[PDB]
Amino acid sequence: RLTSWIVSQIGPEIEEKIRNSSNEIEQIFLYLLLNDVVRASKLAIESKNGHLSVLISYLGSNDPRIRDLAELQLQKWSTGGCSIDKNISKIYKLLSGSPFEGLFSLKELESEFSWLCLLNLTLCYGQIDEYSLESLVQSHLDKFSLPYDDPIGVIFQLYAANENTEKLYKEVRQRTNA
Amino acid sequence: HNELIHDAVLDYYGKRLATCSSDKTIKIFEVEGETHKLIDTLTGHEGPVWRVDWAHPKFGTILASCSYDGKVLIWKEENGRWSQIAVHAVHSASVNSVQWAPHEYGPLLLVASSDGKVSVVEFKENGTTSPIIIDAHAIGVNSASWAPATSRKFVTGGADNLVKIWKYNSDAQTYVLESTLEGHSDWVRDVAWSPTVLLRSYLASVSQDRTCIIWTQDNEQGPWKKTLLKEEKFPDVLWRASWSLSGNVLALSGGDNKVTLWKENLEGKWEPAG
Amino acid sequence: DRFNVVGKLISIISSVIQNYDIITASSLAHDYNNSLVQLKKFSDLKFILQILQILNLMILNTKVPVDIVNQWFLQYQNQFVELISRISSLFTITTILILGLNTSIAQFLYMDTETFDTVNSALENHPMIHYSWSFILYYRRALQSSESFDDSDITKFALFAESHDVLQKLNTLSEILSFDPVYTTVITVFLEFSLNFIPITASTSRVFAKIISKAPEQFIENFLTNDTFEKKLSIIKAKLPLLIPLINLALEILSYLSASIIQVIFEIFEISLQRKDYTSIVQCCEFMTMLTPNYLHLVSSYLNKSDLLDKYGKTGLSNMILGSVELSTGDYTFTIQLLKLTKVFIRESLSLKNIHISKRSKIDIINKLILHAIHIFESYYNWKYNNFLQKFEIAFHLTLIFYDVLHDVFTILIISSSANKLLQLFLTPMDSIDLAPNTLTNILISPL
Amino acid sequence: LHPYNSRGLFEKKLMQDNKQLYQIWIVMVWLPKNVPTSKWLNSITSGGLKSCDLDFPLRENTNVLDVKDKEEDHIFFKYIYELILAGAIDEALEEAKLSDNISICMILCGIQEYLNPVIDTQIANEFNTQQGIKKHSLWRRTVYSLSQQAGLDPYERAIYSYLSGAIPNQEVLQYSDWESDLHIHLNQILQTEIENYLLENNQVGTDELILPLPSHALTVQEVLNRVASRHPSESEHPIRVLMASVILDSLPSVIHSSV
């Protein structure tokens, strides 16, 4: 239910950039943001990339061995030559199991997209509830500051601070009057 | 147009013929004798058309067609009407060779272009063209004939003037540079490998220097040997070269219309013959 | 004999470039072992390194003739190829390190002018166009500053190095090679000119911070015998190590500095707990090793509860309040500082050192850190370094602290009352390695 | 066992509640290089490279990177074809990783079905974390598109045939004899029929393929008549005929033809 919610509300911003001109891998990444996996693979298939399409059809799922290989491959790139694509780097950020908690942190999508576009990335490719929810959304507040001024923002924040709600509730009741 | 004709090559049956020109089309004129018969005029091109070739028949008869614009149009009759079933346009410059692989080998059209490139068109499983890009000559590759069995082999003709022999290996996946030839000093026109029915191939590597240098392999494991058709500069400049399927007889027409039936005799003399 | 490598360099640097699998023969067969046909191609790569050492001290060599020194414009077209990384990488470094320093240069290659004239004609083609080339030329106009004076060309190269390819992509990589450290001697001898006349690179902020940390002969060869330049050496050093190209290219005593220098920088790290400008942390807490041997006589006070390394009055190894604030360097190499500090602890409790606090203390400072079984062991660094040169020095200082007491007696003793505390962690599988090789079954894919 | 499972417990129950398929699986399964890794240097310098990955190889030519690891995609894959009929795929993972591949080796972690303390209950205890792919059937039909990919030369793909059940692509042959046919044969007999079995247990849908699934069940004895007519070079070995008959499980019939 929760990810349906996260996905629904990033509906317009992702559909806007679907319409617009985009990298091939920028479209695969954006399809994946509205949680579409097969479609993303089929566009991988069209770029003549079969081995890639295998990688898009792990997603919806992570497992521990592909993280170590994805990490090892981003690092091969660093001590390698010049020219990289950014979105290709993003596909490996999903594969590393670690959308923000890997060797690169995505701040290109909090200047183009929302902080809600970030919360989709932890709950779907930042491990799929081998952790509890509460701790995932709390580590994700610490990383990215979820407004004290959005009302849907403060919902997240007092699911994050489930543990000792009262203190953070008094403070944000002064900061959200909507 | 049909008056500054630059190719007219038949299939292996000899019953089908395709003639191109400066017409920007491929007027299909099949052989019924010195009468030929139109079946369709294929418009798709912009600019002068250089080479066409029908397929060797074991994978249809399928007409490639290379031209100024950048384009090789795969035409095929499918239910008594034509349809350009693929496009192979990976070039910008003048495309100068199309020659199918012989039906002793499988489906491997050979495209060459003066943009620098040879392209070994790999027919996929719907007939979907996919080349591997190779270079032979880095001024431009003006020609590309196949080497059949007198694994896979061909030859390309220089705008660097070299005539590079190209031989396939399957532990490196591409055409290994077999050897490199040069007795040429202006650009190569046509590199024609002989289809002899026995161990022997001569190569009339036609040149603009007003000379044609016949490299000779007496038997295939004999080396490439420099001989000349004649040992002088010709008055005019020399055009398309062919070798027969049985006899290994040279046939070329000159600028002044030099008829050539000069086959190598005992004495090693390119000797006038029937 | 060192002058006879003349041709051996240009060969070897060419053969690692584009030039790999190359056959004239065709139709090669398949399956046997399914041979060894593959294998030998990796031997080729190993070998290319072995040759090129001599170019990392080619400033101890004679003049390189005008011929091969000419060709940098049909040998400039692979960019000097900038783990098979490092193997490739050599050629940028070697051809740069052709010019070091010792005071040797004098022309008023590097003795000749026909070199620079012939080369220059074909140029304007980057900070490899300019690295080692405009440097010999900086001296070539510095001795012309009572003569006619030419700068026109030299500035133009200076400006051009500011375009496309960066200059930093070199000074980082030098470090990142380390097969034999003659590779990391290209720096700290060439860095004098890189600030001197080139418009001041802000990003040295990053790179040179790593270089001041320790340096005992290696990086400090480049002065204190030199007088060759009149700019950026020990001509401006005789005067407190704090210009401001003074600390971008250049390196009892305790109390003569500043009550001691030790007492100063106590609280200066207690500030930092969310802070940025990582540069500070990787040059100051890593310069804790130039006084940490043989002494803990005043350090001890702070170390009891440091915000370097503590777990008895701080959460984690007091660097998960300086490891969860960042993902960058200053967590990673901070945690390496933790490990180096720790072996320097045990290293002086194998035997007494003097004016210095007690041996019993030098184990109890570790016994604070004894807190890790819980999940402090798991926290220690984030994301996986899986490149096979490092993240292997992270539990190679933890593993030897039950070899230096249960099998390493060097004072007659060693174990006395220390066993009580020791055995809280070192006498219980973790410190005896039941989970050290099991963090390393995909981080080490190697000796398997 | 029962009540609600991933795809992991389905597969266990399958093998549990028949024993002629379980033996068929055991037949096909029963019967060193030093590589420093890294790429992407030499590629940008001559021409383009432009993005680092072995998917650059697949947008165009497979000459674009280093060509002494173009070597390795033939050669170390040949070692891998001896290995898979010596059993396992995690063996083949460890050699794929020396092959200078590190994102094409993710395909051999792909072969794992979902083993989880969120959806299995007797595989929740030898694992305390998520393993495999729970889109394992869309993985199977997408690693089966590579088995036919015609940009892929046979020395890569023949193991990608085999990862989705083995079409005989001639480099899953290295012994080429009666029993080498039969392994790859029997691999496809189980690999069609697990999807069928998973259509009962509903791990096959219409979002679970890019290619329509072969839901034809395949017969053992008839594919042995294929094998028998193919190799009258192993009809001369009666022992190779004894071998056949225990996987048929028709021991009186052979023993009555040999007296």
UniProtKB/Swiss-Prot annotation, chain A:
Membrane topology of the entry: Peripheral membrane protein
Protein name: Nucleoporin NUP145C
Coiled-coil segments on the chain, per record: none
Cellular localization per UniProt: Nucleus, Nuclear pore complex; Nucleus membrane
Domain of life: Eukaryota
Lineage: Eukaryota, Fungi, Dikarya, Ascomycota, Saccharomycotina
Location of this fragment in the whole protein: 873 to 1050 of 1317
Residues of the signal peptide: none
UniProtKB/Swiss-Prot annotation, chain B:
Positions of WD repeats: 1-39, 44-85, 90-131, 136-176, 183-225, 233-272
Task of the protein: Functions as a component of the nuclear pore complex (NPC) and the COPII coat. It is one of 5 proteins constituting the COPII coat, which is involved in anterograde (ER to Golgi) double-membrane transport vesicle formation. First the small GTPase SAR1, activated by and binding to the integral ER membrane protein SEC12, exchanges GDP for GTP and recruits the heterodimer SEC23/24, which in turn recruits the heterotetramer SEC13-SEC31. The polymerization of COPII coat complexes then causes physically the deformation (budding) of the membrane, leading to the creation of a transport vesicle.
Keywords: Cytoplasmic vesicle, Endoplasmic reticulum, ER-Golgi transport, Membrane, mRNA transport, Nuclear pore complex, Nucleus, Protein transport, Repeat, Translocation, Transport, Vacuole, WD repeat
InterPro entries, per the entry: Sec13/Seh1_fam (IPR037363), WD40/YVTN_repeat-like_dom_sf (IPR015943), WD40_repeat_dom_sf (IPR036322), WD40_rpt (IPR001680)
Protein name: Protein transport protein SEC13
Entry-linked PANTHER family: NUCLEAR PORE COMPLEX PROTEIN SEC13 / SEH1 FAMILY MEMBER, PROTEIN SEC13 HOMOLOG
Topology of the protein relative to the lipid bilayer: Peripheral membrane protein
Subcellular location: Cytoplasmic vesicle, COPII-coated vesicle membrane; Endoplasmic reticulum membrane; Nucleus, Nuclear pore complex; Vacuole membrane
Top-level taxon of the source organism: Eukaryota
Encoding gene (name): SEC13
Swiss-Prot record, chain C:
Gene: NUP188
Cross-link (Glycyl lysine isopeptide (Lys-Gly) (interchain with G-Cter in ubiquitin)): 214
Family membership: Belongs to the Nup188 family.
Boundaries of the shown chain within the full protein: 133 to 828 of 1655
Protein name: Nucleoporin NUP188
Subunit structure: Component of the nuclear pore complex (NPC). NPC constitutes the exclusive means of nucleocytoplasmic transport. NPCs allow the passive diffusion of ions and small molecules and the active, nuclear transport receptor-mediated bidirectional transport of macromolecules such as proteins, RNAs, ribonucleoparticles (RNPs), and ribosomal subunits across the nuclear envelope. Due to its 8-fold rotational symmetry, all subunits are present with 8 copies or multiples thereof. Interacts with POM152 and NIC96.
Protein's job: Functions as a component of the nuclear pore complex (NPC). NPC components, collectively referred to as nucleoporins (NUPs), can play the role of both NPC structural components and of docking or interaction partners for transiently associated nuclear transport factors. NUP188 probably plays an important role in NPC assembly and organization.
Modification Phosphoserine, positions: 148
Region (Leucine-zipper): 83-97
Subcellular location: Nucleus, Nuclear pore complex; Nucleus membrane
Additional comment: Present with 11700 molecules/cell in log phase SD medium.
Lineage top rank: taxon: Eukaryota
UniProtKB/Swiss-Prot annotation, chain D:
Signal peptide positions on this chain: none
Domain of life: Eukaryota
UniProt subcellular location: Nucleus, Nuclear pore complex; Nucleus membrane
Subunit structure, interactors included: Component of the nuclear pore complex (NPC). NPC constitutes the exclusive means of nucleocytoplasmic transport. NPCs allow the passive diffusion of ions and small molecules and the active, nuclear transport receptor-mediated bidirectional transport of macromolecules such as proteins, RNAs, ribonucleoparticles (RNPs), and ribosomal subunits across the nuclear envelope. Due to its 8-fold rotational symmetry, all subunits are present with 8 copies or multiples thereof.
Additional comment: Present with 8580 molecules/cell in log phase SD medium.
Family indicated by similarity: Belongs to the Nup84/Nup107 nucleoporin family.
Protein role: Functions as a component of the nuclear pore complex (NPC). NPC components, collectively referred to as nucleoporins (NUPs), can play the role of both NPC structural components and of docking or interaction partners for transiently associated nuclear transport factors. NUP84 is involved in nuclear poly(A)+ RNA export, in NPC assembly and distribution, as well as in nuclear envelope organization.
Protein name per the record: Nucleoporin NUP84
Species for this entry: Saccharomyces cerevisiae (strain ATCC 204508 / S288c)
Entire-sequence positions represented here: 96 to 363 of 726
